[PDB]
Amino acid sequence: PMFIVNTNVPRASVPDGFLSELTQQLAQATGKPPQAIAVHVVPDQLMAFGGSSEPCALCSLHSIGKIGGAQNRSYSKLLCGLLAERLRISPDRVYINYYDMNAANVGWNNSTFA
Amino acid sequence: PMFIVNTNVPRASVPDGFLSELTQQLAQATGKPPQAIAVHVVPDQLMAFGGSSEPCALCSLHSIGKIGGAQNRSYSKLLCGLLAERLRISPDRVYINYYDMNAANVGWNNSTFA
Amino acid sequence: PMFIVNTNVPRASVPDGFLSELTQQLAQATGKPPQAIAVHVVPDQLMAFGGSSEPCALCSLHSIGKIGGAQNRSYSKLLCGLLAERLRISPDRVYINYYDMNAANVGWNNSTFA
């Protein structure tokens, strides 16, 4: 799984340990081992959400499986909770796009996962 | 809806008001209220388009519905017109990927839109 | 086709010529002409892959066709080889998400490719 967060929050507000904590929490939530988890945080962005430039986040979670109605609700609670707690972004100012990737469309280590 | 623009145009060439104007124009084009619109501009990028590093843009519009053949043609005219007018990027150096997101695959406010 | 590379490798480690070489090699691999190829490199990112912050890359390749099981295996060998050779990123520290785009969902030049 791969989680990306783009936000207008400044780099100095991203706490040390945030990528590690995302890795561990996503491993637990997806059921996939941490060895397979990639995380990416992109601060200082120029963005607006609902006509305001107050703190917000545009995110995405891509996974080979483990994506669906109930799981996504559960991810959204978890990930909004983390972004609220660590980056002070209110949950109603976060979008998370979920992608269920086909194994044949994910490359890694000179091949794909098919 | 969420609109992202990645470009090699410098940050000082993005006019003040560009994010608000994108918000308003996208609200009108998609028929969705501005409260639901998110916009993200990423300048100063290292990129090339057709073997040239002249001004270009790689963009995406994600929306829960309101994506289809005719609408997308209409969005592309609108968006290329704005990028040409405001950032001085020629329309033939812009790509816009359109994604029709399932409500169950978009998180927000601790849950999804399903 | 559009190829994007997000990496924690520093900007000074991206060699001159890297975007041109990506353009050329992607043109040969996809069979599409270089006029249609767009490439984007984003260095200095805050990221982790498998619980480590050693050099890694999160990438994507979007193409109107030319995406499938065998082609993606081929692309992944090619692109991991380039990233290993030019940016010193090990292949097992790279993810590449492949997207087969519908022509009606790609805008360019005030219209779409449908």
Curated annotation (Swiss-Prot), chains A, B, C:
Residues where substrate binds: 32, 64, 97
Superkingdom as given in the UniProt entry: Eukaryota
Effect ascribed to mutating residue 110 to C: Causes formation of interchain disulfide bonds with Cys-80 from another subunit
Cellular-component GO terms for this entry: cell surface; cytoplasm; cytosol; extracellular exosome; extracellular region; extracellular space; ficolin-1-rich granule lumen; nucleoplasm
Induction, per UniProt: Up-regulated in concanavalin-A-treated lymphocytes. Up-regulated in macrophages upon exposure to M.tuberculosis antigens.
PTM sites of type N6-succinyllysine: 77
Active site as annotated: 1
Enzyme Commission designation: 5.3.2.1, 5.3.3.12
PROSITE patterns linked to this entry: MIF
GO molecular function, one term: cytokine receptor binding
Coiled coil: none
The UniProt record lists the keyword RNA-binding: no
Catalytic activity, as annotated: 3-phenylpyruvate = enol-phenylpyruvate; L-dopachrome = 5,6-dihydroxyindole-2-carboxylate
SUPFAM superfamilies named in the record: Tautomerase/MIF (SSF55331)
Additional information: Serum levels of MIF are elevated in patients with severe sepsis or septic shock. High levels of MIF are correlated with low survival. Drugs that inhibit tautomerase activity protect against death due to sepsis.
Database matches in PANTHER family: D-DOPACHROME DECARBOXYLASE, MACROPHAGE MIGRATION INHIBITORY FACTOR
Involvement in disorder: Rheumatoid arthritis systemic juvenile: An inflammatory articular disorder with systemic onset beginning before the age of 16. It represents a subgroup of juvenile arthritis associated with severe extraarticular features and occasionally fatal complications. During active phases of the disorder, patients display a typical daily spiking fever, an evanescent macular rash, lymphadenopathy, hepatosplenomegaly, serositis, myalgia and arthritis.
Similarity comment: Belongs to the MIF family.
Protein name, as recorded: Macrophage migration inhibitory factor
UniProt source species: Homo sapiens
